[PDB]
Design an enzyme around this catalytic site. Structure first.
Site, PDB file in Angstrom:
ATOM      1  N   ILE A   1       0.840  -1.186   0.000  1.00 27.85           N
ATOM      2  CA  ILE A   1       0.000   0.000   0.000  1.00 27.85           C
ATOM      3  C   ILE A   1       0.879   1.242   0.000  1.00 27.85           C
ATOM      4  O   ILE A   1       1.788   1.373   0.815  1.00 27.85           O
ATOM      5  CB  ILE A   1      -0.929  -0.004   1.215  1.00 27.85           C
ATOM      6  CG1 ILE A   1      -1.936  -1.137   1.075  1.00 27.85           C
ATOM      7  CG2 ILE A   1      -1.657   1.335   1.347  1.00 27.85           C
ATOM      8  CD1 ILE A   1      -2.750  -1.399   2.321  1.00 27.85           C
TER       9      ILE A   1
ATOM     10  N   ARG B   1      -1.384 -12.496  -0.021  1.00 30.12           N
ATOM     11  CA  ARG B   1      -0.139 -13.265  -0.131  1.00 30.12           C
ATOM     12  C   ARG B   1      -0.231 -14.691   0.406  1.00 30.12           C
ATOM     13  O   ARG B   1       0.442 -15.595  -0.118  1.00 30.12           O
ATOM     14  CB  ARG B   1       0.996 -12.540   0.589  1.00 30.12           C
ATOM     15  CG  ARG B   1       1.429 -11.235  -0.047  1.00 30.12           C
ATOM     16  CD  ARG B   1       2.263 -10.440   0.919  1.00 30.12           C
ATOM     17  NE  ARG B   1       2.674  -9.141   0.378  1.00 30.12           N
ATOM     18  CZ  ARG B   1       3.052  -8.120   1.129  1.00 30.12           C
ATOM     19  NH1 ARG B   1       3.044  -8.235   2.452  1.00 30.12           N
ATOM     20  NH2 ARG B   1       3.402  -6.978   0.558  1.00 30.12           N
TER      21      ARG B   1
ATOM     22  N   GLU C   1      -1.530  -8.939   3.144  1.00 35.65           N
ATOM     23  CA  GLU C   1      -1.009 -10.198   3.690  1.00 35.65           C
ATOM     24  C   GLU C   1      -1.953 -11.378   3.444  1.00 35.65           C
ATOM     25  O   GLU C   1      -1.497 -12.497   3.180  1.00 35.65           O
ATOM     26  CB  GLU C   1      -0.681 -10.089   5.180  1.00 35.65           C
ATOM     27  CG  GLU C   1       0.335  -9.007   5.543  1.00 35.65           C
ATOM     28  CD  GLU C   1       1.773  -9.305   5.112  1.00 35.65           C
ATOM     29  OE1 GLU C   1       2.012 -10.241   4.310  1.00 35.65           O
ATOM     30  OE2 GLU C   1       2.683  -8.579   5.582  1.00 35.65           O
TER      31      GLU C   1
HETATM   32  N1  LIG Z   1       2.824  -0.880   3.282  1.00 32.57           N
HETATM   33  C1  LIG Z   1       2.350  -2.148   3.124  1.00 32.57           C
HETATM   34  O1  LIG Z   1       1.350  -2.333   2.475  1.00 32.57           O
HETATM   35  C2  LIG Z   1       3.055  -3.258   3.733  1.00 32.57           C
HETATM   36  C3  LIG Z   1       3.805  -3.099   4.881  1.00 32.57           C
HETATM   37  C4  LIG Z   1       4.438  -4.196   5.439  1.00 32.57           C
HETATM   38  C5  LIG Z   1       4.325  -5.413   4.808  1.00 32.57           C
HETATM   39  N2  LIG Z   1       3.585  -5.593   3.709  1.00 32.57           N
HETATM   40  C6  LIG Z   1       2.972  -4.535   3.175  1.00 32.57           C
END
Ligand SMILES: NC(=O)c1cccnc1
Ligand SMILES: *[C@@H]1O[C@H](CO)[C@@H](O)[C@H](O)[C@H]1NC(C)=O
Length: 246
Positions: free
Chosen positions: A71, A163, A160
């Site tokens: 993000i 994933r 997540e």
């Molecule tokens: N910024 C994010 O979307 C982020 C942060 C940590 C792990 N995965 C994604």
């Protein structure tokens, strides 16, 4: 774009949304039947827009980098919000330009910095669909400390979950009651890059990891992943970070 509404949401609709989020990410090959995210995408096509509606029907639009499922920032009414880091600065050249103002959040978009800003680690923050409803509502009106916690919830319930099927399932189990993430969830989040790399390096090594990855399983025990016949690889992980970005 993809969309998800909290009003009427249930484990089925959430699972379908996460499937749709995964399938919105471009890829040109699979490695052990898992989509491999692209090394790079130029221009606006690098960003997927996720429209999220809280229970009351108020909405934010979240910009996700399709190369890594990170993000970058989000739009709430006429205000955009971006993490304080180069990748989000770049993103703001392409998405939400129609916003009347842009606020750069006083932290980068990694767990280390978000946890410091929130004043708590992931381990102590309940997640679930109610927590996601709360997170959306928090992000509608600027408050940087509150936003850090809301973003920790948002990241884990969208990126997540996309994933890892196990994390998707954890959120489904938390459809109507939030609960802190399991040890396994934390371990998977912390290992996405490492797992992605080893699965790619296993192609050329007969499915064998060059370096085993240590995780925690759903029973709370340490386990070592050494090859692609592990359930972590055959059923759990759903997207691979390209080694070009590791
Ligand atoms: N910024 C994010 O979307 C982020 C942060 C940590 C792990 N995965 C994604
Ligand atoms: C490969 O992984 C499977 C599944 O986890 C495991 O049962 C097997 O022992 C591994 N092979 C090794 C370590 O040589």
């Amino acid at each position: 774009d993809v969309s998800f509404r909290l009003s009427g949401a249930d484990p089925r609709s959430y699972g379908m949304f996460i499937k749709d989020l995964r399938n919105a990410l471009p890829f040109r090959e699979k490695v052990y039947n898992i989509p491999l995210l692209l090394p790079s995408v130029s221009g606006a096509g690098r960003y997927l827009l996720m429209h999220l509606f809280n229970y009351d029907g108020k909405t934010i639009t979240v910009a996700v980098d399709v190369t890594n499922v990170y993000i970058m920032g989000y739009l709430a009414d006429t205000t955009s919000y971006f993490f304080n880091e180069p990748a989000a600065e770049l993103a703001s050249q392409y998405v939400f330009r129609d916003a009347r103002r842009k606020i750069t959040l006083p932290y980068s978009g990694n767990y280390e910095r978000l946890q410091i800003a929130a004043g708590k680690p992931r381990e102590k923050i309940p997640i679930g669909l109610p927590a996601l409803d709360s997170a959306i509502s928090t992000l509608l009106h600027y408050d940087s400390t509150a936003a850090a916690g809301a973003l920790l919830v948002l990241i884990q319930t969208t990126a997540e979950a996309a994933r890892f099927k196990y994390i998707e399932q954890q959120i489904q189990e938390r459809a109507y009651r939030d609960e802190v993430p399991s040890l396994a969830t934390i371990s998977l989040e912390n290992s996405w890059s490492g797992l992605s790399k080893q699965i790619q390096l296993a192609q050329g090594n007969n499915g064998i990891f060059r370096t085993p990855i240590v995780l925690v399983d759903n029973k709370g025990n340490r386990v070592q992943i050494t090859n692609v016949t592990s359930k972590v690889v055959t059923s759990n992980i759903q997207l691979l970070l390209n080694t070009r970005n590791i």
